[PDB]
C-alpha cells in the first residue's frame, strides 16, 4: 500500500540517457521519506510547487533516477540548448514536473558508484546515401533512439557508436557521439518526477 522507492537505493544507477524509470499507481508515499536520505542540492518544479507535489493526489506518479554531475546542472534544465535536453533527457512542458539534484551521503552504502558520468553529445540518423543526416531530438518523456546503439557507459570520451539499420528500417545508419565526466567523490544523482491525470483513479495520494 506504500510506494516502493527501494529499487532506487539498491544497485548502481543508470546514466541520464538510459535512466531507470518507476511508475507508481495505487499506493501512498512520503516524499519527505526519499529526500531524507540524500543531500539535496537543488529542487525546482514547473506547473507545481515543491510543497504541492508532495501533498496532492494523482492518477499515476512517475519517478526517473540517474547519475548526474552537479557541474552540468545548467545544461540539464529548460532553456539550455545543451545536448542533455536535446539528446538525453527532456521533461514534460504540458504536465507539472520536478527536477531534483542530490548527492549520495557517505552513510548510504547501498547505492553504488558508476565508473564515470556518461551522456550523449549528439544523436543522428544517416540516410541510405550516408550523406544525409537527420538529427534525432528527444521528445519529452521519451528515450533517445540512440540508447539502442550506445553503451551502458561510454567506454571513452569522444567514442562514436554506430549501427546499421535493417533494410526493413529503410537502411542508412544510426549514429551517436558520447561524452564522459569523471566521477565525483560522492555520487551525484538526478531525479525526475512527473504526474499524470486520469478520471477513474486518483490512487496515488500521500501517506498520513
Amino acid at each position, epitope marked *: 500500500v506504500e510506494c516502493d522507492f527501494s529499487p532506487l537505493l539498491s544497485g548502481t544507477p543508470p546514466q541520464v540517457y538510459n535512466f531507470k524509470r518507476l511508475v507508481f499507481t495505487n499506493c501512498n508515499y512520503n516524499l519527505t521519506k526519499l529526500l531524507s536520505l540524500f543531500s539535496v542540492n537543488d529542487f525546482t518544479c514547473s506547473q507545481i510547487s515543491p510543497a504541492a507535489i508532495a501533498s496532492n493526489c494523482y492518477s499515476s506518479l512517475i519517478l526517473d533516477y540517474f547519475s548526474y554531475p552537479l557541474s552540468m546542472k545548467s545544461d540539464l534544465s529548460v532553456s539550455s540548448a545543451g545536448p542533455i535536453s536535446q539528446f538525453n533527457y527532456k521533461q514534460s512542458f504540458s504536465n507539472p514536473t520536478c527536477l531534483i539534484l542530490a548527492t549520495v551521503p557517505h552513510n548510504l552504502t547501498t547505492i553504488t558508484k558508476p565508473l564515470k558520468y556518461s551522456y550523449i553529445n549528439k544523436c543522428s540518423r544517416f540516410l541510405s546515401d550516408d550523406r544525409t543526416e537527420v538529427p534525432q531530438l528527444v521528445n519529452a518523456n521519451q528515450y533517445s533512439p540512440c540508447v539502442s546503439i550506445v553503451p551502458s557507459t561510454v567506454w571513452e570520451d569522444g567514442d562514436y*557508436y554506430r549501427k546499421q539499420l535493417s533494410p526493413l528500417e529503410g537502411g542508412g545508419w544510426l549514429v551517436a557521439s558520447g561524452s564522459t565526466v569523471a566521477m565525483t567523490e560522492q555520487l551525484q544523482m538526478g531525479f525526475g518526477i512527473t504526474v499524470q491525470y486520469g478520471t477513474d483513479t486518483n490512487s496515488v495520494c500521500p501517506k498520513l
Partner: antibody
Amino acid sequence: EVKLVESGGGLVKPGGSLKLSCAASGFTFSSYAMSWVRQTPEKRLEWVATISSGGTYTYYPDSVKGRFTISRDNAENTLYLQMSSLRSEDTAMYYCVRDGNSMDYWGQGTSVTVSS
Amino acid sequence: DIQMTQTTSSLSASLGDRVTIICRASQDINNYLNWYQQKPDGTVKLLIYYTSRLHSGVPSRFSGSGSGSDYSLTISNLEQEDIATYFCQQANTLPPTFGAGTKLELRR
C-alpha cells in the same frame, strides 16, 4: 568483409608469459573499442579485457586483472594481449572482438594452453 | 558479477518450427542484452543487440524481446543451418557476463 585474425597462441608453462595479436581490417580500427573474450574447455564464455577506441582506457575482470595487459595500436591496426603469471585456469580459446554495446564481430580464435 | 541463467541447455525442433530461448539475469539489466550464435565449427556471430535490435546481415527469423531481467530469443521457420549453440550476454555493468548456452538440434 570485416576481419579479425588472432595469432600468438600456444603452449606455455604455469607462471609463464605470452602475447597474443589480432589483425584487424575492413573497418576503421581507431573508432571502435576492442575486447578479448575467451572460451574455456567447458565451452564457457568469459570476458577478458576491453580497451577504448583511444587506447586510453582499459578494464579487466578481477580474476584476470594485473596479470593481463591489453594494448592497441591504431596505426598498426592490430590489438595485442599480453599475459603473465599464467595458470591452468587461463586455458581457453581467445577471440579478437569488436565492442560497443555488443560484440560486433569475432575472430576465429587462437588456442592457448597452460600446462607443465 | 551478474549471473545469467539460460533455463534450458538443449532443444529439439523441426524445420519450420518456432522455438524460443530465454536468458534470465541475476539483477535487472536495463535492457542491455545481446545474443550470439556459435556454429559447430566454432564461429560466433552476433544475432541481436539491445534485446530487440537485430544485427545487420542477420535475417529476421531471429527476434528478441524482454525487459527487466527476463529476455527471450525467438527463431522461426528453423532451417538446417540454424543448428548451433546460442549464448546470451549482458552489458549493463562490468564485467559482461554470459550464459552457458542453449544447444539446438533439429529433428530428422
